[PDB]
Structure 1
């Protein structure tokens, strides 16, 4: 649901808003950007929608859109025009302006669009350009700089400059600049990807009315404008309908299917035009026209129906630009965790104020120093660390050959609990192998003919040779792999469309109804010289086609034979025919209605084909099942073939059970019924067809969750059924991933949390994730790298927390004795050590093998909190131990209490504390960087390892080598060498202790937690169902 809110312009209120929110404070701006409804209400008065000058959009999320004027006024929301419909006093999307006009209306527009009407319509529909705005670099800098985080960083810069800490201010500025530049790089790279995806600049001639023509730019097109297509072909600039002609088009960009598709002229009729119903008659935007020819007339004509963002390409681009929010929140209790850190920060700030009062510090300086302490705990480099983490993850995936359009989905990839796989072309090879054809002799099957070439010239051989959608492209047939192999098996050569016998008269294809996955069948109308009348051949699902055949033509053995070939793993389609009493000619034969042809056939035979499992499929499936990630197969193929492939690919290990759920339709006199018939060779899976799934969803919503939880093979699923299944699974709190290659999986890939399409280009739009490899190996890679990304982000957050608390502790310890860290010591710690380490942590790659244990989801969990508190206890212990150990030395000289830092620097206390803390930052970075089970070991990150080694060596030099940077850093020299070695020993003790503590926690904490407060259950619906089924299996 949506709603508008119009606010007519008023300058007095605007200036009042400006003065109030500028003079008062920035807090009103903060809460306005948090709650903008108040801001808009204050800025201007609600007004009549017709008089509206600004609109607020609720979908609640509030968006503000200016109502532009061009006599005609409109407004763009998410790239969608809405014009001012004067008669209805409302804003209707331009998508609906011409909607509903009949096919005959399109054929009337066929001739062209009047130039005056063209310019009248260009304003309404706008230029035919999917435009991704190209923001100027200053505009982007404004986009990022206005972040309140960078506002606080600028406040810190000012505060430190006021205190004469110039190097620290420079450090803050440099880190903020690095963060801003990394954000710029991220945004610019994403925008460049999209922009380069949706480039289009070409000149297309338009059949202007009156019979003449005109060469216009592709951006001048408007719905109803007439396209004349180039005979040799070219990129299609806008969605259109084929009024006249036939077109071969490559829809790979739009759907990822590289096989050329056949496009035909729109059929005249008094019914509404629809890009979905008439998809076969409509060219799409961004698809390549391989070659089109005109059956009648000098040139092929098409009529534009959708331009700009209205197009399907435009719809996908808009969905990318404004993605649906990710429902999962990766870092649970993030606010509560930052609050548990802020309580410590506030306690320390109060303690700092108390001590500074105790030391009799002037109130002008007490507030300044407490404010400085406040600025300490905000890490300048946190945004840079996060953005670098995401960039490294994306780069790793791209190097592996997997491209993600929304990098935020990478984290989701590691949270997958269920993966749905298309069977054909994803688990099994794209190619087929004709094992033979099973002809019929009356009402009984004959022995399999392994070589169809030897079939006598008759209905079956002509059906094999002719029932398909092949097209000769550059003297090479192209089309469905099944059609290619079927035709090749017969030896007939493609040359409407005619076929030449292998060596027996050539046969013409008068008319052809293409294959639709929803219909899961396909037919043609055929005639040859000497034919009394044309014959229509149908080729589709064996069980569906057998329904169209006359009951006396289908053998009583049909089910058993089809299962004999299907239960062996073959891919079977049936061929049926019926003589058409129409006179053989394109005139009548081209006017046939598909339904008139499909019904009342006469089964001819079964075409058995051998589709093989990909070599890489079984290892991947077994790896997925080893880590308790449910593997589900959603396919449109036969149920027995699907089950055999599942048993062969490890989705059903031999020991495990399998039960076929079969649902009977609610025929008259009885309701729908569920019957479970187990088939002999967690531990129990279910298999069910598509009609059975629909019956279960409609009539057994109570048992539907139990079917979904333990259902593994979903066969004979239509594309809408695949999308519905994905949605239903997601309703069980599953994190569903879908790995399908075909175009019939577009809906599932959109709906799935993680959608992967296998055979794609360097980049694409079809699905969130796209790969270049033909195997399903991308699924384990995506899951592994998503787990690595989650662990890396958690480790970076933990390190920044530890990094902050350590600096906080150091500064508190130094305040307690009336001194500070130092001008250049702050720079060193924040930039040379911490930024380097934080940006190098994330470069480490993912673990090579998936593991059963999932990455943690909560930042506030007892493990993480205990780790942080124990680490900080060790850090404070080490720093205070060093501080109290230096006081014990005979050569110790206490700092000058009276003068305050940086005046009292250098001194022994600051020197010792700085040395220990500087080592501790590297120690903590090494401690938090866990390798297993989600990442590679630390040492495989050669940049990060080298950074640690070099920084540690430099710090040891500072401690040991006299005079090294002891002036620039304001470090006091410690003549005693035994105490230097004692400081190094304390540092080594901390280095060992942090790692031992981390290991002890990560090993013995989960066991103690389980044995202490075991979880009664899990909020996940599917986990509840799993436990319930274990308690009581649903099928007895």
Structure 2
């Protein structure tokens, strides 16, 4: 359901809105960006939809759209046009304008569209272009830079500039500015790349009423134009229906398969033309026409049905354009409420301490920046930068490094079959000869055959030509001739190293007979030899019944039930004289009759050598591998059993759904096919029928579905989205244009292609194997572990500084600008960068990292470490006050005037060690990272900073002038402080170990969680309890 709200404008009201939102305050702009309803109710008056100039489109999601008048009122919502029909008084979508018009209606368009008609239809539908918007850098910045965090960072920078904290403000400002500039550049470059990808400019020939023909740009195409298709082929500029002639189309952009698809003219009937019902008569935008035949009439005719975004390619592009962090944000909000409480206490004590008002405000507001660290996201990003560098070294290119963290959450990866799991093209599996009347064993090496009829039939029965000293022609012909070892030189062929045979004539391959004929001869022969090659069931009807085996159909189906490309070959001795004076005057029908079937050639798309190891490694780590292919279900099932997606002990069930016809509803048919433990296999049609008519059975299908074949690109996207609705973290790995929606919609989409799929995918790999998936999963698990560690350190760091500054505020002192700077810059930056440094573990494990920062382990660790930190700091403070040499701090003045003093000195000396202790304690090794002792730079940095601090404590006058520290002459007290920090070190490491070891066991044995939050785990539970298909 949708709702259209109409708003006009008043100039006085427009100026009034602008002044009230600009001169009064800047906050109203952000308030209106957070809810645009108030902004549109203030700036625009409500107007009747017939006069509206602004519409609020709400689907809950709210959108605002400007209404454009040519007259023709219309608007664009997500690339789709909604023209205003005055007679019906509504904004009707242009996709529905000629919906349900008959096949005779399409056929009457074969004479073309006039110029007046084309102009009105271009006014209505627009140009035949997929127009992708590339925003300007200000327009692009308003989206990102208005992040709430960036506002908090701006507030903190302004505060630090008001507080003479210039250097850390400059560091934070530089980091944020470079990050924003990089994000803007990346987004604009990706937009420009996608725009260049979807752009299609070409000259097309359209029929015009009166018999004429006009060459126009493909953008001038409107629904109702009659395209004149080139006989030589080419890219299809729009969606069309064939009304005259036939075509051979490469539909890999829709299916991923380069096999030629035959398109025939639409049938003339009084029934509504449908792109799915008449898919075999429809030419889709972006697909490649290989050749077009005009049997009746001069030229091949197609009637334009959909242009622009209304094409299937346009729908895919629109889906691409218009589709841990939660707990991080909630923890930051909790840090903010703690900031409010600490600010109240700070105001109270500073007013007690007789601090001036402006200084009270500065201190209380600086406490907020203290407890909420402005440098948290950069610290979280450093680990993803390390992971991205490692991945680029391994050949995997990531455009957004923060997407790497999602690799640690993946429980399911979807795979395209062709080019991703299997090779791009077919390979010669063998040739099946015939001895006598029965089949022979399959011969994997056709050149190992003797020099007989079948070898020369494989070698010379084709239509290849030599070009650039390289054979060019039919691809399967090229591969079989490469297999035979014979080299091309009508034509002649030399054996692999026999007698070189020369072709005497050749009859072309026609799509009607779907078979080819040649006539060959050689010196030392008795008579010429004619070869025939084509569809095996069609060649079998021409040979003698005493040559075709009785097991022919069964063997052919056994071959083709696995997705093999069988092609038969036959031959004939001809009583013709061995001369071209009679051999070129043969009619082909006499050659096709009385054949002798020589055998079959079996071609298959082989599984890549890296596929089965990776799939078995994924299944061993309990990650679901799902085949989502555009190919047929038999090939998909065979490849899924081949790559180990379906183990031989496991059961596969085909789910077949039937459309609800007149009088009976849709039904689900389950047919178990002989060889988790239960896998489901279904087609695109079945997937759609289940999505529409069985929405309660759909989750079980998605939880048990392993093979999804014959899927359209939007169906791949829908599968990815429906699996994400089950709370899966979904990965997609594909290499085709039909995979772009699923690669953009997936959490981790890896592109095996460098063209037209690299644009929309977060990750691109230079290797054509799926070995990138375990690499990305390992790097993502390492990055998620490292990000947990860095977040825990920054939280502990924020709290430690909070406790320090509170203890010091209570006595009317502070830490010190240079002590603040040491802690903020030197310690914290060194620690964050060298924590993020370590790489991933070498082995994938079955257990994956936690994806929740609000977990009980994380919160318990933080709380206990902070208890120990607060205890050590308060104990050192109260031990300092108990000393005989201790003197109070002259509370009459405030910091930094009362510095140096013993209290700040001891508090800083303790907390500065605590930062390194917590840094070392939150860091982890196994199972998702390399061992912590291998991080030699980090350990050396910890030791060096510890030695610097031990010098600050022990060596008199060491940096005490700069850091405004007080000299303590009691060496026993300094040794007591060092023993206290050693206590904190040992206690922090023991706390981390005790938690990481015994907290899971206690959480399990104490309160058992029988039900997971994940929807798919609950579905797996209830399927284990009650298996759905009985």
**TM-score bucket (shorter structure):** 0.7 to 0.9
Q: Distance in 1 between matches of 2:242 and 2:496?
A: 35
Q: CA offsets, 1:369-389, max 9 Å, x none?
A: 323323322222234345555
Mapped contact 1:537–1:576 kept (Cα < 8 A): yes
1:812 Cα deviation (Å)? 0.3
Q: CA deviation at 1:777?
A: 1.2
1:366 Cα offset (Å): 4.0
Alignment correspondent of 1:64 = 64
Q: Kindly state the Cα deviation for residue 88 of structure 1 after the two structures are TM-superposed.
A: 3.8
Q: Deviations over 1:289-313 (max 9, x none)?
A: 9999999999999997766555555
Q: Deviations over 1:634-663 (max 9, x none)?
A: 678898987776566444667767789999
User: SS of the counterpart of 1:361?
Assistant: coil
Deviations 1:452-481 (CA, angstroms, capped at 9, x unpaired): 899999999999999999999878667997
Contact 2:253 2:738 in 1 (8 A): no
Q: Following TM superposition, by how much is the alpha carbon of 1:623 offset from its aligned partner in structure 2, in angstroms?
A: 1.6
Displacement of 1:59? 2.1
Shift of residue 863 of structure 1?
0.6
Measure how far apart 1:818 and its partner are: 0.8
In the alignment, is the contact (CA less than 8 A) between 2:332 and 2:372 conserved in 1? no
Q: Deviations over 1:322-358 (max 9, x none)?
A: 3xxxxxxx44555653454445444433433443354
The separation in 1 between residues aligned to 2:269 and 2:523, in whole angstroms, is: 32
Q: Is the 8 A contact 1:512 1:525 kept in 2?
A: yes
Contact 1:245 1:264 survives alignment (8 Å): yes
Secondary structure, aligned partner of 1:460: helix
Residue 832 of structure 1 aligns to a residue whose secondary structure is helix
**Residue 103 (structure 1) shift:** 8.4
Q: Conserved in 2, the CA contact under 8 Å of 1:257 and 1:743?
A: no
Name whichever of 54-63 and 26-35 sits farther off. Answer: 26-35
1:794-824 Cα distance to aligned partner (Å, 9 max, x none): 3343333222212211110111111112234
Bigger mean CA deviation after superposition, 977-986 or 517-526: 517-526
Residues 403 and 762, structure 1, Cα contact 8 Å, conserved in 2: no
Contact 1:247 1:263 in 2 (8 A): yes
Structure 2 unmatched runs, 5+: none
Change (3 A) 1:209 1:174: same
> Cα distance 1:826–1:718, how it changes in 2: closer, same or farther (>3 A)?
closer
Deviates most, 845-854 or 942-951: 942-951
> 1:752 matched to which residue of 2?
746
Shift of residue 831, structure 1, vs aligned partner: 3.7
For the structure 1 residues 893 and 431, does the alpha-carbon distance in structure 2 shift closer, same or farther, using more than 3 Å as the test? same
Distance 1:525 1:686, change over 3 A: farther
Alpha-carbon distance in 1 for matches of 2:691, 2:511: 21
1:777-801 CA-to-partner distances (Å, cap 9, x unmatched) read 1221232233334334433433332
> Relative to structure 1, is the Cα distance of residues 180 and 276 closer, same or farther in structure 2, using a 3 angstrom cutoff?
same
In structure 2, C-alpha distance between the alignment counterparts of 1:396 and 1:516, rounded to whole Å: 53
Q: How does 1:534-613 map to 2 (within 5 A)?
A: 561=555, 608-609=602-603, 612-613=606-607
Contact 2:752 2:764 in 1 (8 A): yes
Q: Deviations over 1:845-891 (max 9, x none)?
A: 43332211122132222111101101212222333333334445555
SS in 2 for 1:659: strand
Local SS of the residue matching 2:204: strand
**Corresponding residue for 1:499?**
493
> Structure 2: how far apart are the matches of 1:6 and 1:315?
27
Call closer, same or farther: CA 1:45–1:447 in 2, change over 3 Å: same
Q: Is the 8 A contact 1:253 1:765 kept in 2?
A: no
Partner of 1:327: none
User: 1:171, 1:827 within 8 Å by CA — same for their partners in 2?
Assistant: no
Pick closer, same or farther for the CA change 1:535–1:18 going to 2, 3 Å: farther
Distance verdict in 2 for CA 1:605–1:648, change over 3 Å: same
Deviation of 1:915 (Å): 3.7
Match of 1:345 in 2: 339
Deviation at 1:840, TM superposition (A): 5.9
Question: Is the Cα contact below 8 Å between 2:339 and 2:372 reproduced in 1?
Answer: no
Aligned counterpart, 1:834: 828
Q: Does residue 817 of structure 1 match 2:811?
A: yes
CA distance in 1, matches of 2:29, 2:272: 50
> Are 1:709 and 1:1025, in contact at CA under 8 Å, matched by a contact in 2?
yes
For the residue of structure 2 that corresponds to 1:1033, the secondary structure is coil
Q: Deviations over 1:61-107 (max 9, x none)?
A: 11112223443443333344444444443334455567778889889
Task: Describe the SS at the equivalent of 1:448.
Answer: coil
* TM-fit CA distance, 1:1022: 3.9
1:393, distance to aligned residue in structure 2 (A): 5.0
CA distance in 2 between counterparts of 1:691 and 1:261 reads 19
Change (3 A) 1:206 1:439: same
Structure 1 distance, partners of 2:451, 2:830, is 77
CA distance in 2, matches of 1:302, 1:667: 30
Distance 1:593 1:386 in 2: 77
Moved more, 442-451 or 593-602: 593-602
Secondary structure at the aligned position of 2:243 is classed as strand
Distance 1:676 1:804, change over 3 A: same
* 2:737–2:757 Cα contact (<8 Å) kept: no
| Residues 737 and 755, structure 1, Cα contact 8 Å, conserved in 2 | yes
Contact 2:751-2:757 at 8 Å conserved across structures: no
Of stretches 777-786 and 514-523 in structure 1, the one that deviates more from structure 2 is 514-523
Indicate how the Cα distance of structure 1 residues 75 and 745 shifts in structure 2: closer, same or farther if over 3 A, else same.
closer
Q: Is 2:567–2:602's contact at 8 Å kept on the other side of the alignment?
A: yes
Matches within 5 A, 1:418-497: 418-421=412-415, 425-430=419-424, 432-436=426-430, 485=479
Take 1:476 and 1:1011, find their aligned partners in 2: how far apart are those partners?
71
Query: Gaps spanning 5+ residues in structure 1: where?
Result: 323-329
Change (3 A) 1:215 1:680: closer
Tell which deviates more after alignment, 286-295 or 641-650: 286-295
After TM superposition, give the deviation of residue 58 of structure 1 in Å.
1.2
Distance 1:267 1:353, change over 3 A: same
**Separation (CA, whole Å) in 1 of partners of 2:920 and 2:307:** 55
What secondary structure is seen at the aligned counterpart in 1 of 2:679?
Answer: strand
**Does the C-alpha gap of structure 1 residues 258 and 660 become closer, same or farther in structure 2, counting only changes over 3 Å?**
closer
Q: In structure 2, do the counterparts of structure 1 residues 260 and 196 end up closer, same or farther at CA, with 3 Å as the change threshold?
A: farther
Q: Which residue of 2 aligns with 1:377?
A: 371
| Distance apart, 1:42 and its partner CA | 3.2
Q: Aligned equivalents of 2:735 and 2:66: distance in 1?
A: 41
Contact 1:576 1:605 in 2 (8 A): yes
Paired positions, count: 1029
Checking the alignment, whether the CA contact within 8 Å between 1:548 and 1:601 is kept in structure 2 is: yes
Structure-1 residue corresponding to 2:10: 10
Q: Give the direction of change, closer, same or farther, for the CA distance of 1:705–1:20 in structure 2 (3 Å limit).
A: closer
Higher mean displacement: 62-71 or 173-182: 173-182
Structure 2 CA distance for partners of 1:966 and 1:747, relative to 1, 3 Å: closer
Q: Is the 8 A contact 1:563 1:640 kept in 2?
A: no
Taking the aligned partners of 2:67 and 2:315, their CA distance within structure 1 comes to 22
Which of 1004-1013 and 565-574 deviates more? 565-574
Q: In the alignment, is the contact (CA less than 8 A) between 1:182 and 1:387 conserved in 2?
A: no
Does the 8 A contact of 1:332 with 1:857 survive in 2?
no
| Cα distance change, pair 190–568 in 1 and its aligned pair in 2 (3 A) | closer
Larger mean Cα displacement after TM superposition, 563-572 or 894-903: 563-572
- Is the contact made by 1:403 and 1:763 (CA closer than 8 Å) also made in structure 2? no
User: 1:25 and 1:462, CA in 2 relative to 1: closer, same or farther beyond 3 A?
Assistant: farther
Question: Quick one: structure 1 residues 540 and 818, their matched pair in 2 at CA, closer, same or farther if it must change by over 3 Å?
Answer: farther
More divergent stretch after superposition (869-878 vs 658-667): 658-667
Q: CA deviation at 1:1009?
A: 0.9
Distance 1:24 1:859 in 2: 40
Alpha carbons of structure 1 residues 20 and 587: separation in structure 2 relative to 1, 3 Å: farther
Change (3 A) 1:459 1:1015: farther
Contact 1:430 1:481 survives alignment (8 Å): no
Q: 1:1012 to 1:662 in 2, by over 3 A?
A: same
When residues 526 and 904 of structure 1 are mapped into structure 2, their CA distance, relative to the original with a 3 A threshold, is farther
Conserved in 2, the CA contact under 8 Å of 1:477 and 1:484?
yes
1023-1032 or 699-708, which deviates more: 699-708
Distance in 2 between residues matched to 1:724 and 1:533, nearest whole Å: 61
How much does 1:839 deviate?
5.7
Cα deviation code 1:215-249 (max 9, x no counterpart):
98887776778989999999887778899999999
Q: Once the 2 structures are TM-superposed, how far is the Cα of residue 608 of structure 1 from its aligned partner?
A: 4.0
Match of 1:408, SS state, is: helix
CA-CA distance at 1:1012 after TM superposition? 1.0
Query: Secondary structure at 2:590's aligned position in 1?
Result: helix
**Aligned partners of 2:609, 2:472: CA distance in 1, in Å?**
26
Q: Which residue of 1 aligns with 2:774?
A: 780
Matched residue SS, 2:439: coil
